[PDB]
């Protein structure tokens, strides 16, 4: 318990602790750590004269050691640090070691007076502690496939840490596994459809008090303008649910219920489309889960992503056939004639995380360091990887980066029955200042986005034709008002629609007798067509008007068929195309032609909130950041400042939904990619949206101006809801902990098995969390009582708003990534085998 901490020290009555008080020890929850300092009764001032101790704290390992072997190692170490040329071996006795320590002590106090400070000794003792297997990674091994090498799970009933107890920490309650059993309804994924421990400090989203706080935070983000700036035009309109497969899926009912109660998205498409919210949910069970739950949010179409990636973007010898582009999707686009698609979705080829950091890892693991752990890169590894990356982008033969980006975007931006999401890093450089440098594909993508507003409407037909040595796909939109190939349309149908012709093989050669006959639809008999995009020897030629293409007009026949031959279609191999891209639009669309349609106020009657109809198809999502954006050097280069200045560009592209980066002030621990490039996903304060300090994207005021500028053009703005984990807490806590895998299963024969461990898991209690934490739970329970009545699926009980989280503490977390502090960091009395409690 509390004894006296010392025949280990022969200056025992000088070096013994000032008093029996707690104020004379650097403790964590009244326990002592190998790095704990204390106030002795006397200091050996300048290693000369025993002086009698104000702010004169000294290391405990100066005068106390857990084992005699540790004293030896401490003597050997500090001898080498202070220039004492003498080591002591295995057979040395206790008197020799005590005199060695009572010499080290003297020279320590000499250097404290010479150097006039103590930092050097903090670093020297820390360094010594990290050499001992019981106080470093050695006792935390073996490592597992956790992104940060391993995790520890906080025990629900800890006799020595009752303040860290919980009746919850219910793990792996993914949408698939929400009830603690695999859902029998969803068979596309044989697994439990995710895992609890992803990164850093894992928030216990099974805790009813934490569930209430996540809703509190959700309300805050959807009212950020009203709350921060008393400005109702600066609110986030929508959310992205980050890391769905790594959190308790009760948050999906909580967020869906909130959108229904607060925004009325279930009433009609106008409400739903004004607050269009998305998941990042990787399991193939999550889409059908979300559909049954009421389409309160939309998921990615992961099948179409993989179809694009493997048909178009992969290297030439790893490339699949093209037919997946038609059939391997939530929607079979062979003949899509539906007023409303069965399931709503968003579609993409890349995102901030998907096919960016994966490519940087491939480059690092290849040409620099093969022992890289997950995505835990150093900034130097990143900077040099990007020299290889940026050169590969402009190569015809790419070894690392995507082929056929423009072919992918031609399908994404003409496909029916999905909301396309354009990735920032496909129009601008993944690195560098925001919107500073255009990619070689910027023009093609910009042309398609403007064309989409003007031409892309009506039913869809995709065909896969075997011709010459290879294959092509055609994708057609029949024009506004023409759902079917037989619809003869009105005037606007005639001057809308589009044909996309694509091949994914550079050797594609048509025989002289080969015809590609593309049915444009019954509205397009005997009609002039002109190119929008054509593949050339060196890249892609874009056509910004009918007149720019005046020389390349061709005609449909009396059956409404465009016909192409060897003269028109062949394989190419340049930095932009590896195969063929041709895009054709009808001649004579007015300069201001817009075939998009607004969401109706008519009541929804199918029990779903979001409907993949012409109104949702008219939307475009923009992922408005890159992980590897440069840090701003001046205020004009801040992302949110550039966004406000360039908002006219987004409206011109038909961006309806601007997905902003997470706006939380980033932690700087560098324990993951996210906390090295400071994207916003690694944070300590959920409510610090550039308030205490700028985020990577600017000040809180810069954010407010960015949201208002986007709102000024009718553009909705999405907040990144990130309830899975938090990084780099400033206050230590002692927890009873067990070494686990990412699923929370206890490991082999770990020395960390219901033992004390020192976590960084307490917030300051003086941050934005302390101000806004649970601040809106009374307002929410008053307006929307049904939210707090619902018995959540994973727990069987409602959210508990009776407690407010002003300070994060281990009792609200499942556990943490291993911190390299070891299984024995909390000091015991050698004799009693008892943890020191003060
Ligand atoms: Ca989790
Ligand atoms: Cl259909």
Short description:
This protein has 838 residues and is α+β, with helices and mostly antiparallel strands.
Description:
The protein is elongated, with a radius of gyration of 32 Å. Helices cover 27% and strands 16% of the residues. Helix 5 (208-222) packs parallel to helix 7. It has 25 helices and 31 strands. Among the domains are: 12-136, no CATH class; 457-586, Golgi alpha-mannosidase II (Immunoglobulin-like, Sandwich). It is an alpha+beta fold. The longest helix has 21 residues, at 94-114. Strands 10, 13, 14, 15, 17, 18, 19, 21 and 22 form a nine-stranded antiparallel sheet that branches. An eight-stranded parallel sheet has the order 8-7-25-24-23-12-11-9. It starts with 11 loop residues before the first helix and ends with a strand. The structure holds calcium ion and chloride ion. This is Glucosyltransferase-I. Belongs to the glycosyl hydrolase 70 family. Production of extracellular glucans, that are thought to play a key role in the development of the dental plaque because of their ability to adhere to smooth surfaces and mediate the aggregation of bacterial cells and food debris. GO terms for molecular function: dextransucrase activity; glucosyltransferase activity. It catalyses: [(1->6)-alpha-D-glucosyl](n) + sucrose = [(1->6)-alpha-D-glucosyl](n+1) + D-fructose. The PDB classes it as transferase.
